[PDB]
Amino acid sequence: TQPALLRLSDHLLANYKKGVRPVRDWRKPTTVSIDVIMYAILNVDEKNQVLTTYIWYRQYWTDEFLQWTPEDFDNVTKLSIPTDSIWVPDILINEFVDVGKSPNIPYVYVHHRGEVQNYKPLQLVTACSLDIYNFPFDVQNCSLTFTSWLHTIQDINITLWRSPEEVRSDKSIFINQGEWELLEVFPQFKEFSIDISNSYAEMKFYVIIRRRPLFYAVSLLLPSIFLMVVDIVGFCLPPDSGERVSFKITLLLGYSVFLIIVSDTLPATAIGTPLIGVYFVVCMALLVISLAETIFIVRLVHKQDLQRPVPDWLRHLVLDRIAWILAVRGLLQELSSIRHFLEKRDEMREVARDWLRVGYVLDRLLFRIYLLAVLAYSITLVTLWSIWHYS
Amino acid sequence: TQPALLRLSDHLLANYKKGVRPVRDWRKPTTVSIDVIMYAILNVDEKNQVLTTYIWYRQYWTDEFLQWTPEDFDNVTKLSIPTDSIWVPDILINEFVDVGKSPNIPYVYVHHRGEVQNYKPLQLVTACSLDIYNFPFDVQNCSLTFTSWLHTIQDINITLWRSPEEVRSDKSIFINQGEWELLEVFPQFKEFSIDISNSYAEMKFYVIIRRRPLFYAVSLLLPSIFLMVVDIVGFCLPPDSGERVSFKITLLLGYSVFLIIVSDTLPATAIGTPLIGVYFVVCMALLVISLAETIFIVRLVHKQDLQRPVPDWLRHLVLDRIAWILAVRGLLQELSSIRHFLEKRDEMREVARDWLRVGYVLDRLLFRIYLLAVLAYSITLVTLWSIWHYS
Amino acid sequence: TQPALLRLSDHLLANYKKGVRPVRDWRKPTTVSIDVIMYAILNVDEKNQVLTTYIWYRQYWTDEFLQWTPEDFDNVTKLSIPTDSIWVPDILINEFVDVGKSPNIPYVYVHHRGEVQNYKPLQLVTACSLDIYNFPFDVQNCSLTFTSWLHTIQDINITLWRSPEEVRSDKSIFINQGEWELLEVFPQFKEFSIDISNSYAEMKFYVIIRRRPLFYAVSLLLPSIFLMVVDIVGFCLPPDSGERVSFKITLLLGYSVFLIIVSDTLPATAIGTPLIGVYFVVCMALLVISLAETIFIVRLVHKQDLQRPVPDWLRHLVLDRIAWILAVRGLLQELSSIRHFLEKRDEMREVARDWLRVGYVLDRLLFRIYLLAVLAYSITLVTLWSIWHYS
Amino acid sequence: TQPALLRLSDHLLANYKKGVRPVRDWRKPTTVSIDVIMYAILNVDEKNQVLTTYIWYRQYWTDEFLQWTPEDFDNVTKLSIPTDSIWVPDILINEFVDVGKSPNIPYVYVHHRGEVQNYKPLQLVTACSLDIYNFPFDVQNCSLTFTSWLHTIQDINITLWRSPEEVRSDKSIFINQGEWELLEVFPQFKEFSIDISNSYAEMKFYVIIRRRPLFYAVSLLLPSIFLMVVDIVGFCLPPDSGERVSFKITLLLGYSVFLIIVSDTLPATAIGTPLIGVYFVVCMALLVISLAETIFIVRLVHKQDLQRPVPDWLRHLVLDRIAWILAVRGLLQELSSIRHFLEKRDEMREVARDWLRVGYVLDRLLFRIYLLAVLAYSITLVTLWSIWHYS
Amino acid sequence: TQPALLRLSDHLLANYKKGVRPVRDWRKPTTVSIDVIMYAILNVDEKNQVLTTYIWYRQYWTDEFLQWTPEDFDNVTKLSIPTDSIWVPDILINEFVDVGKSPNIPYVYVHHRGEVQNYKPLQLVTACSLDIYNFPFDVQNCSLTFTSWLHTIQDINITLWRSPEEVRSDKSIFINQGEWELLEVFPQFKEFSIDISNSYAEMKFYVIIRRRPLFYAVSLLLPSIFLMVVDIVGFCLPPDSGERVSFKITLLLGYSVFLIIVSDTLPATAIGTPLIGVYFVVCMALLVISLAETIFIVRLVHKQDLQRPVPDWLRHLVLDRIAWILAVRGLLQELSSIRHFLEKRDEMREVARDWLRVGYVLDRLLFRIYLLAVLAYSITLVTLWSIWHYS
Ligand SMILES: *[C@@H]1O[C@H](CO)[C@@H](O[C@@H]2O[C@H](CO)[C@@H](O)[C@H](O)[C@H]2NC(C)=O)[C@H](O)[C@H]1NC(C)=O
Ligand SMILES: NCCc1c[nH]c2ccc(O)cc12
Ligand SMILES: NCCc1c[nH]c2ccc(O)cc12
Ligand SMILES: NCCc1c[nH]c2ccc(O)cc12
Ligand SMILES: NCCc1c[nH]c2ccc(O)cc12
Ligand SMILES: NCCc1c[nH]c2ccc(O)cc12
């Protein structure tokens, strides 16, 4: 006698004519209204200039083909019908490496005022620019864009639906102890035109994502502590001995092994320059210049050299002080010959005493240069931490 | 004359109207009833904060559009019809990296009471948090979530169908000799609301998965045995010789090679800190401080140094004791000169005898410090094993 | 006037009603009949506890909806119709990492007796347990399983169709010079029941796959030949010199480099323990205990030590024998002083002669221990080869 | 009373007959008109001779089945209908490794003049040849091709639609601070015929893509600065000592480690030869020839050798100058014997004085050879930079 | 008045009955006619015994359901209709790892004689055997196979359509400067039968693909040049000194590092044996036997040894020659004692003179053995190059 409410859906799906743009008047544009929220962001591999994310997407647009009345229809204000039989526009992410593995979920809402609602989960992995000027503290600024690809500015209207102050702080839905944390987003409207008389719609979502170097600080500052340890063990030894040389070549090789461990654990891109690794290579360069000085001291303690201290080295010293600062006859003859050979034997020692005073001064000079270099890098690190603390 | 039972399926599929929400009364919510079991869990790559699993999923929901009578229908209580022609809700896993490669299997059950049954195998690889505070013994706690994505709390009711005590212990179906073993799961009901007047359903499955370090114990405790072997071979040698130095630099390089073998075989994440590797780096730091002490002993056995034992080293010693604890004339002249040169020749030996007593005491002091460090780490390892044995 | 035979297919496809379970009587179960053959097996990556294969699958089941008569139909006993319009059950592989990239091939056979035939190529990559107790000779036992996922034991009957003796030896179709070779398979029937009054069908295919170590034998036995070469070059040298020490530290580092080359070329899993690498680490442990003995001999040739040979070393020796086994006065005074200093100069040599006899005996003792260890490992390797030759 | 404009779409979709080639006259070919723009190019992995890109594609073709009149149709000049119901040709990229993950976007334009418009985003990863003759400055020339795969030259006409001067410079739409930058493209028309009487259409897009070595210059020129540093520290030392040998073997090993760091960070292909790495291997070859010379000098300072300076070394020197350039008797006897033994003791020194003058000249000769080699490589590098600056 | 030609396609698609095997008489088999061409072959990763290719595929088969007349149909001899509405057989590649990412392109040709034409691009990555007996020159022989998977030998006839002499040389369509080049292909027909009374069709395409080692020759022959350089620097040094030992241990470690660089840049499979790397390991084995000889010479220059030259070493020498080839009394007493101690002091030198003549001869003997080994390997390399030049 009395059928169910499903015939009402037949009255919702009698003569719909799917495929046509749903408007009463054609020059009046239809209005879609969109919103986005970020549940949890996945990892950033960052080698391919790429980033991954997984967001929840809300939209609704006025369909105007469907009228419902509250009377005699058993008060079904909200009801779900499949999206494969109704109209849907094309809102797409751009600059993407591939489309995310998203489900279909064919259900959308219909109501009395005609508009159709849609919720969808979608993930996107896309190419975007990141700054690696400072490695442990990264800005990681990016921008996503949505557009009506096949429709124009008088075809589909873009509505953000929400006041930007509560868009600015959306931290109620976020996963704990993640590596990357978000601080604020910024919605704004633009337009891009390729040629004349063709203007298409564009919506953009500005994103600031931030990671803290809680793991990188302990694992990266302690190699600098090891640098200070090898610097202060390169301090108390006399420069004239070769034992510091035989230690420091193995120390340079072990330092290169430990730093290539750190740098292949964390490699960088071909676009940006990590200045921490650049300063590590500068330390390796200053250490091999120090090793050139070291083998100069190794050659300096030899007996045979032709070097000039009078014409120009005195000028360098003055410039430093100005800017920077019968058988008894045979018996006596043979014993005097023994005395002469013994005198030659301890005559060996006087040849190396003149050399030892010069190279120690030049070693202390280049040690002061390296100390000012380490102090300037410490000022640079404190300044970078203060700039990041300014935020 | 008499057709087959397939016309009965025509009576089951005459006027179904697929796509409408099947209810008699609209404000009365439909009830789905769900259950999950885990046949075998796949490997966890754990670098991407991700885990893989493969589970079997059971659900059934009251359709109410289909009535069957036991009389005159040849007693077909249970029969299979394809799922592409009937209604199905949307129950989805969240925080997933991609949807699993699952089959379609278009067959579902219909009965006399109206409800439709569904069995499906599904695998999911999803992002989840893991704790790497202690590397060989891992808690590996996680949580999965199912929800009605497009339906609300008065739309679809979630039913767990099974008493939680027999949910707590489900070990009848599990694969032997796997790396990861499960102990218990915990079903519970929650609700999340983003804004006002919008409350959606949520079901959560708590999972404890556990691996035993049967391979990691033998392969990780034996490097500590090698650490004790190199510690006790660093004990019996006299500190004044350079042979311990020339061995210990090669020993430190070989120890670094063997430990980078262990650590690139098992790397960690950028979020958590493996304290075993941290203690290995602490041992490398104490060994290079020991090497700084070692080259201090190498410089200590030289003849030329200006060090003060009287003003402050005696204060350090007191502080340690308080807190821690004619031709014959020419012949005689020349032979006396030979005696004088020979006296100088064995006068060389007395200059190095004063140094040798001090550095041995400081070496034994820092050896006691390292022994207390190894003993404290042994207490820490036994305490961690006891905490894991508490479970 | 006379149409073609395609109208016969219309008589085969007039009122089929796809989607219903095809039976005359419902409690009588339909019978599927299945068979499998393996054309070529792909590689096993074996790190993820996973294996890949590509097999050919034959099945046929009685449809009973389709009757053909040999009279007046131009003798079409066998004809092909698409499988998208007819019924098909669900026979699935389990414990799979993902479904194989298989084609569709929509053609199946129909005949006079009603049953429908199906041939399909399908590949599967699935998780399965492998034994790595012995690395070059692997058993590689596994089991695959097929089931009716949505049907019960009174719904679909499983038929193997072939006598198990000719299932046991199927080597006519196999690719030559592959790494993995199969020997026999074993078909058997089981049943698994999760809860009461619910019993589902199960078919299992037992598989023995085997690889020969023709590459691993030459590349793995020759490092043991190098171990015997370094053992016999560690034999003829006197232990008192440091030249064997300075060679053996570089030999241990080069041996570690060559063995990490072998072991990162062939790594193992986190579940099983490769005992060949375990014995390699045992050889490294015995070599560093030998190196501790070696530096004990290095300290043994020094002049200053306080060791006790009388109280306990004699007890150790007895235990080894029991279980294991005027101016002329000034001239004469000064020349006698020269004689005294020269007597002291060759008095240096007598202090080191007492030490040299003890450590050679202990070195030969630990060399006998290492020789018995290598001989026991040779017995173990011959025993393992004999156990594999037993098959 | 008055229906909407959707019935007009019914008048657009009444008797379309999708699947037929839309022409009035068959021998008159239909005309497609195409254009391409490059929004942002992705990274080039370049190991697989492959490159990735993401472009925007515009096309339109005359359909001629659809007539619209401006009168009485409410002025709908442009309207969107789905592309799944209308005709579309096959324009495909060739030599592709796989098809890009592109969306469907089922909407195309229809107008009064009959032609249908289509916009699509598509990415393609394809095999193409690149030149690695010079590593930091790469030409990276390539060519893409579009064709009508199933249609012939009298079937589909290809139209580029745009004047080639404004095709030549299209830099208004390009992403900033990318690694690869484009300069110009070149459109042209060709034709390929496999056999006789079969000629098919072809369109080709020539692409010049360019990367700047802003990261590679600083990271690659500074190893050459290190090469000059080790060259000038190999200058001031005397060749006769072994300290330069013991440094230079460790210097060669450290140089090989640093260069294998650079070369496994940036590897090359199996097709092209990177001449910078070739010159690095040439420097390693000249350094091991220098090391052979070095150990020749090491053997040169020994006392026992049989070498001929008279017959042929004088000829080599002339060729170099021409082209390149009672008891007292017992007392006296025994003291004369002491004099004879002391004379033998300082007779040791005269044997090594003759050798030292020759090898220094040959060392300076090969140092001049290496200096001319480094100077020629500097000329080569400046010439290559000038050729790239010519562009 | 006069409709278009699309109604003709309706006359082509009125009563087609898709899904039936199209024949007039059933026992007369339908004939497909196929051809293949290779545009460009992709890279071969060769670790997984796998190869990739991308080919163009041409086929046509007689449909016989469609008749066209040249009269009154406006001369449409060739026209395109979609392939989703017409019959298509199943021609598949076998032994494939996965199906290639191929497009759909739903357009096929129909004509007056009834047959339907099809062109398709398809790529396939498949498992196939390769020979690595000689590494730089590879045969790389393979075979592909096509078959009618679901049809028998009286169902579908295979036609190659082209004379085999012009199949033998098809080099008009091939990409320049690729790594792999093809020389000839060989078409032939076979048949495989699993059981009795079941014989299915098979077509096979034999492929010879060839790569030239233009990069491998320069990068692989120059390590052999380095082997000759280290061999000739191991020639001029005297064997009695330890300086050759201290160089050659570092030379062996550096040679192992350089060769593991070459061998992890180019690794091999677990099936085949690369004899170049085998000869490299043989050179390492002969060098460590040479190092055992070297440390035998190191022990040979010591003063304390008990070796027998008389009983058996003379027999070895004969076998080599046969097959291979008052106070004055106190003064005189004390000065004679000084003479005796001085006589003992230069009595040290005579003990080491007897040893030095033997080990040089044995060193030259093993050097001749290594020279014959290098000469035999040179003969082997020239012979392998001549065998490859025979082709
Ligand atoms: C299809 O082609 C045939 C072959 O040319 C056409 O037959 C001839 O067409 C010419 C062109 O006008 C006439 O002059 C001849 O008289 C035709 N032959 C005969 C026997 O009448 C045929 O007309 C073409 N079909 C159509 C529709 O034009
Ligand atoms: N799981 C319920 C879906 C859901 C809840 N809140 C949401 C907010 C936005 C969105 O796209 C989706 C949602
Ligand atoms: N072959 C059917 C497997 C099976 C048996 N019982 C089950 C229960 C739930 C489920 O998802 C699956 C199953
Ligand atoms: N994003 C809107 C589509 C669009 C704008 N400009 C374009 C240029 C070319 C093209 O294929 C497409 C477009
Ligand atoms: N543009 C069509 C390419 C093409 C030309 N001739 C061909 C022959 C065979 C084939 O598969 C493809 C082709
Ligand atoms: N070309 C058909 C291959 C084939 C021959 N015999 C078979 C038997 C079973 C099977 O799945 C496949 C086959």
The residue ranges of DSSP E strands in E63-131, in sequence order, are 79-81, 91-93, 96-99, 108-110, 115-127
Sheet of A200-211: strand order equals A91-93, A141-148, A200-211, A180-192
- Give yes or no: residues A208 and A229 share one domain: no
Write down which residue in E176, E193, E212 finishes a domain.
E212
Q: Which residues, other chains included, contact A327 with Cβ-Cβ below 8 Å and sequence gap of 6+?
A: D328, D331, D332
Q: Is A119 in the pocket of ligand 2 (CB under 6 A)?
A: yes
Distance CA D124, CA D205 (A): 14
Burial (CB count within 10 angstroms: exposed 0-12, middle 13-18, buried 19+), residue C157: middle
Q: How far is CA D333 from the centre of its chain?
A: 85
Question: Widest CA span of chain A, in angstroms?
Answer: 163
Nearest alpha carbon, ligand 6 atom 10: C56
Cα of A150 from ligand 4 centre, angstroms: 8
Answer positive or negative: Cα dihedral of C175, C177, C183, C189. negative
Judging contacts by C-beta atoms under 8 Å, the chain C residues touching residue B123 are 97-98
Which residues are registered as beta bridge partners of E144? E205
C199-212 core/surface letters (b: 16 or more CB in 10 A; e: else): ebbbbebebebebe
Q: Are residues A221 and A191 in the same domain?
A: no
Q: Does ligand 1 lie within 6 Å of residue E69's CB atom?
A: no
Single residue among A179, A212, A245 that ends a domain in this structure:
A212
Same domain, B134 and B174: yes
E-assigned strands of chain A?
Answer: 30-40, 50-62, 79-81, 91-93, 96-99, 108-110, 115-127, 141-148, 156-159, 180-192, 200-211
Say which CATH number the domain at D166 has.
2.70.170.10
Q: Hey, how many other C-beta atoms are within 10 angstroms of the C-beta on D169? A: 10
Which residue lies with its CA nearest to atom 1 of ligand 6?
E149
The residues that bridge with A148 in the sheet, in sequence order, are A91
CB atoms within 10 A of CB D272: 19
Alpha-carbon gap: E64 to the closest alpha carbon of chain C (Å): 11
| Contact call for D288 and E226, based on CB within 8 A | yes
Q: Which atom of ligand 4 is nearest to the CA of D121?
A: 11
Which ranges in A320-357 belong to alpha helices (H)? 328-345
What is the per-residue DSSP string for C197-259?
Answer: T--EEEEEEEEEEEE--HHHHHHHHHHHHHHHHHHHHTTSS-TTSSHHHHHHHHHHHHHHHHH
Considering the domain architecture, whether residues B325 and B359 belong to the same structural domain is answered as yes
- Contact by Cβ (8 Å): E156, E148: yes
Concatenate the DSSP letters of all residues of E304-350 into one string: -----STTTHHHHHHHIIIII---HHHHHHHHHHHHHHHHHHTTGGG
Resolution in A: 3.9
Q: Coil, helix or strand for C106?
A: coil
Minimal-distance CA residue to ligand 4 atom 9 = D56
Residues whose CB falls within 8 Å of the CB of residue D2, separated by 6 or more in sequence, listed in order: none
Are B238 and B191 in the same domain? no
SS (H, E, C) A6-54: HHHHHHHCCCCCCCCCCCCCCCCCEEEEEEEEEEECCCCCCCCCEEEEE
The verdict on E344 and E222 lying in the same domain is: yes
Among candidate residues E212, E244, E272, the one where a domain is terminated: E212
Whether residues C168 and C287 fall in one domain: no
Question: What is the radius of gyration, based on Cα positions, of chain E?
Answer: 39
What are the CA-CA distances from residue D29 to residues D24, D26, E68, E80, E257 (Å)?
10, 7, 22, 14, 66
Same domain, E338 and E369: yes
Structure tokens at B72: 């005159």
Q: What is the Cα–Cα distance from B112 to B13, expressed in whole angstroms?
A: 15
Contact C6, C37 (CB under 8 A): no
Residue A342 phi/psi, 5° resolution?
A: -70, -35
Query: In this structure, are D301 and D331 located in the same domain?
Result: yes
Chains B and A contact (Cβ–Cβ under 8 Å for 3 or more pairs):
yes
Q: 């001869």: which residue's tokens?
A: E361
- Segment holding C32, helix H or strand E: strand C30-40
Residue B272 backbone phi and psi in degrees, to 5: -90, 160
Distance between CA atoms of residues E337 and E45, nearest Å: 83
Q: How far apart are CA D318 and CA D320, in angstroms?
A: 5
Whether C59 lines ligand 3, by a CB cut-off of 6 Å, is no
Separation of CA E126 and ligand 5 centre (Å): 23
Number of H helices, E strands in chain E: 8, 11
Of E150, E302, E304, the CB nearest to C105: E150
Which SS3 state, helix, strand or coil, does residue E62 take? strand
CA of E149 to the centre of ligand 6 (A): 7
Question: Ligand nearest C194 Cα, by number?
Answer: 3
Instruction: Tell if the CB–CB gap between E177 and D129 is shorter than 8 Å.
Output: yes
CB atoms within 10 A of CB B27: 9
Q: How far is CA E32 from CA E21, E29, E118, E190, in A?
A: 13, 10, 11, 16
The stretches of chain C forming alpha helices (DSSP H) are: 6-12, 164-168, 214-233, 243-265, 275-300, 313-319, 328-345, 358-390
Strand partners, D147: D92
Residue E120 sits in the same domain as residue E204: yes
For residue B221, the SS3 value is helix
Give, to the nearest 10 degrees, the angle between helix E214-233 and helix E243-265.
Answer: 170
Structure-token pair, residue C179:
């790494």
Q: Cβ distance C74 to C50 under 8 Å?
A: no
Q: Which atom of ligand 1 is nearest to the CA of E72?
A: 27
* Ligand 3: residue whose CA is nearest its atom 1: C149
- Domains in chain D, number: 2
Place of tokens 């050979």: A341
Q: Please identify which residue in the block is written with the tokens 């961690």.
A: B384
Residue B370 burial (C-beta neighbours within 10 Å; 0-12, 13-18, 19+): middle
Instruction: Ligand 1 pocket test: pick from E5, E8, E68, E71 the residue with the most ligand atoms within 8 Å of its Cβ.
Output: E71
Residue to probe by mutation, ligand 1, list E5, E8, E72, E75, most atoms within 8 Å of CB: E75
- Breaks in chain D (C to N over 2.5 Å), named by the residue before each, are 325
Q: Which of C200, C202, C203, C204 to mutate to test the pocket of ligand 3 (most atoms within 8 A of CB)?
A: C200
Whether residue E309 has its Cβ less than 6 Å from ligand 1: no
d(CA A69, CA E289): 99
Ligand nearest to the CA of D151: 5
What distance in Å separates residue C98's CA from the closest CA in chain B? 6
Interface test with A, best of D107, D241, D336 (most A CBs within 10 A): D107
Domain identity same for A175 and A262:
no
Residue-number span of the structural domain to which D74 is assigned? 1-212
3-class DSSP state of A59: strand
Measuring CA to CA, which residue among B128, E331, B252, E190 is closest to residue A178?
Answer: B128
| CA–CA dist C372, B100 (Å, integer) | 55
**Could you tell me which residues come within 8 angstroms of residue C369 by beta carbon, excluding any fewer than 6 positions away?**
none
Give the position of tokens 């098959």. Answer: C391
Please spell the DSSP secondary structure of A137-161, one letter per residue. Answer: S---EEEEEEEESS-BTTTEEEE--
Alpha-carbon dihedral C363, C367, C368, C373, rounded to 10 degrees:
150
Burial class from Cβ neighbours inside 10 Å (0-12, 13-18, 19+) for residue D256 reads middle
Structure tokens at A178: 């993640």
Q: Any idea which ligand is nearest the CA of E70?
A: 1
CB D110 within 8 A of CB D12: yes
Contact call for A and C: 3+ CB–CB distances under 8 Å: no
Q: Mind giving me the DSSP string for E37-61?
A: EEEE------SSSEEEEEEEEEEEE
Q: Please, which experimental method was used?
A: cryo-EM
Residue D71: helix, strand or coil by DSSP?
coil
Round to whole Å and give the CA distance between E267 and E273.
11
Nearest to B54 by CA among B118, B105, B101, B117: B101
Q: By C-alpha distance, which of B255, B247, B225, B370 is closest to C291?
A: B247
Whether E224 and E368 map to the same domain: the answer is yes
Structure tokens at B344: 């100088």
Do residues C22 and C65 make contact, with C-beta atoms less than 8 angstroms apart?
Answer: yes
CA-based nearest residue to D149, from D196, D109, D92, D97: D92
Residue the block writes with tokens 């030095």:
E356
Pairing state between β E141-148 and E200-211: antiparallel
- Which helix (H) or strand (E) is D80 found in, with range? strand D79-81
Tell me how crowded residue B233 is: count the other CB atoms within 10 A of its CB.
21
Give CA–CA dist C276/A172, Å, rounded. 55
Angle at D333 between CA D329 and CA D338, to 5 degrees: 150
Beta strands in B193-238 (DSSP E): 200-211
